[PDB]
Design a protein around this nucleic acid. Structure first.
Lengths: 80, 98, 94, 108, 94, 81, 98, 54
DNA sequence: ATCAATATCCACCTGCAGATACTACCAAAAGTGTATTTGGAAACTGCTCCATCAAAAGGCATGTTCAGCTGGATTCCAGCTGAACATGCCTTTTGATGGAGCAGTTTCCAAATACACTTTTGGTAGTATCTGCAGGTGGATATTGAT
């Protein structure tokens, strides 16, 4: 279950181009995959905590918004 | 045949992707990754579509910010190539590793 | 019969005031709702803290004024303070 | 009885004073709430909304459009010092980034 | 001339439990008071938020448990949860 | 009134603060730079502190006002209450 | 003919000395005068407790020490041992303060 | 943790330095209290490897 | 400077998803009036600690000299990253189906609050008391730098 190679190398290069980067080493891709997986599990842990506290089975957008806000990464647009 | 010098298409892509607002990761792979990660905290969860959309927006914003910081750390050492030690320095200074 | 209150119509009134002939999309209106809610909670939390520090049991105009001064910077703080003061005097004198 | 002229009209505002009063009561912030606190808070909120909307509308009319989208809100926020420093830690969905390339990366 | 409550004697009891013959200075005791107050406010604020999200009007043991899980990491969360659960069962069964 | 006291943060004091931070060699242009930084920091806290003091209608700045300002800037401080 | 340590020896010795201790590193009176000057620029005729100025001193020293650590990291990144102002600026920019 | 530190430095009475040494040396405590300043605490003895001689 | 080849930008067209009105209505949400309580503003006062002074004395800061070592510039080279093609795999759309799980309704019952006494217990002042610890002394130890 390599769903982490779902984040292809051209995708990471696009993300880098948006950040203004002009040249990319060949060892950068594994590093960004690790960073992204860390961030994602950090957020999803608290989202699932918020969910199971309310005795639900469906993760809602508000649970993700709260989990993000508690990390100090407020997100506008999904508050409905 | 016509060939651009190494670096021209790079700045063209920079301008193109800084003029745009789209998402840069495909949606189905990210969805599969999110479900696989959530598989370890609790089994048989369901996700609304807006939940995965919010997760994708947040992840892309995070990564773009990290790449800006990495580019600064690279330029500081008088390079133009970003290397893993620049990412490590940026995250160490932000407090994400420390 | 479940409703869902929001600040859509008030944001639309303000927009028609400052830009008489420009419209707004639905996603931008959701962004504006999120913004209003966030700033409201910030100010109200700070005012509650201020009231607790001084062992007061009431939230008054002074708590809101001090919270505004503590939260907004410079230009924003000055102009918001002036606006709110004018509003309160207009309200009481009526 | 008399005409029930409300409160936001009394204060000369567009935002609702009664709704803000109810939200201050129910939100568990203090055990009493004055009369001028909702008026003050409504005035401040209306001022901030009008500021950000004027900036966003100028951006939208600059890109030859008539209808504001989240990109215009992001361009308005990030281009102003005090707004960018008030909202420095928020993410606007479908907003993008500011066009900016370092000088050393340009050719020549 | 009004009294000033603090957790000094309870911290001293805990210390005499884990280290029977070690003492503590006054500045370290002030640090410990600050620590207890800070962690208490963190947990209580998070539990209040949790209760507001679910439109509940009561703070119960589940809110405290979830706040503990949301605030402490790994080892700390596990052991604190076990300790509090044991305390509550010991209390109710008495 | 009092004016021009940023120079009371002498060069040896900054060198000591840098030694505790692990710094081995220090450029000659650092000192001036550092002073600027410090001033900014103080102005951000004292302002907040004073905003609390005038709210209580007091005239003396207490340690609790400083602790509240530091906390509201995300710089919590243990020891003074 | 007189004894002289080579450059960098007393510096490491001082590093150990000042990392082993807990005292304050700024004189009390100059710092107090500075704080009073700034406060006077904010509101006239103020007073201060002693613990207030002590708290300000502790907080400011902690801030500067952390900043110097981040600056050292940025300097070492560029293959140097001498810290220079551009390192302070890079650290304060990555942190998010300017 | 603080008492173990204090008994390690041949002392019988805990001071703020011992609290700082206990907090900064543990992962989960240092990550719970990562943004607090302890008065009279000092720092952790740590010198980069490149600054050492030879 | 030439120019040939690309990619970008501007004008025009248009079909369509999305903004805009309206009627309805309707639950609900705000304004009016009133009687009651209580929290907060006033006036007074007592004492705490904050600003001022001063004096002496030594510990820290300033300035100067000398040298060493580090940062910065120049050169050269190898290797690693970018640009272009040609496949071919995987994402996307969209159309439909079950179906499980979330949201609204009704009871009704266990649990939390308000109130009144009572015992205790934890906190402060005073006065007291050891005692661990900070500062000093001397000697041994370990490290550095020049041969």
């Amino acid at each position: 279950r390599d769903n982490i190679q779902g984040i292809t190398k051209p995708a990471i290069r696009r993300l880098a181009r948006r950040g203004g980067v002009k040249r990319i080493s060949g060892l950068i891709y594994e590093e960004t995959r690790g960073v992204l997986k860390v961030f994602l599990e950090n957020v999803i842990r608290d989202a699932v905590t918020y969910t199971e506290h309310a005795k639900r089975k469906t993760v809602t957008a508000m649970d993700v918004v709260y989990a993000l806000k508690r990390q100090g990464r407020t997100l506008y647009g999904f508050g409905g | 045949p016509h060939r651009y010098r190494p670096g021209t298409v790079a700045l063209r892509e920079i301008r193109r992707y800084q003029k745009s607002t789209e998402l840069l990761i495909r949606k189905l792979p990210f969805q599969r990754l999110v479900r696989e990660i959530a598989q370890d905290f609790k089994t048989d969860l369901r996700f609304q579509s807006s939940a995965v959309m919010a997760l994708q927006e947040a992840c892309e914003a995070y990564l773009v910010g990290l790449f800006e910081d990495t580019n600064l750390c690279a330029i500081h050492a008088k390079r133009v190539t970003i290397m893993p030690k620049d990412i490590q320095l940026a995250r160490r200074i932000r407090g994400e590793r420390a | 019969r479940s409703r869902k209150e929001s600040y859509s119509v008030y944001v639309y009134k303000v927009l028609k005031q400052v830009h008489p002939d420009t419209g707004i999309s639905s996603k931008a209106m959701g962004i504006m709702n999120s913004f209003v809610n966030d700033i409201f909670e910030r100010i109200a939390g700070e005012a509650s803290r201020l009231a607790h520090y001084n062992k007061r049991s009431t939230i008054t105009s002074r708590e809101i004024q001090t919270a505004v001064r503590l939260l907004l910077p410079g230009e924003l703080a000055k102009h918001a303070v002036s606006e709110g003061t004018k509003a309160v005097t207009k309200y009481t004198s009526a | 009885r008399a005409k029930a002229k409300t409160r936001s009209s009394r204060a000369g505002l567009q935002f609702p004073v009664g709704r803000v009063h109810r939200l201050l009561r129910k939100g568990n912030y203090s055990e009493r709430v004055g009369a001028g606190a909702p008026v003050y808070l409504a005035a401040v909120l209306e001022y901030l909304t009008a500021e950000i909307l004027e900036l966003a509308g100028n951006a939208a009319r600059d890109n030859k459009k008539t209808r504001i989208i989240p990109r215009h809100l992001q361009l308005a926020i990030r281009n102003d010092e005090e707004l960018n420093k008030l909202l420095g830690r928020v993410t606007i969905a479908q907003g993008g980034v500011l066009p900016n390339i370092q000088a050393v990366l340009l050719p020549k």
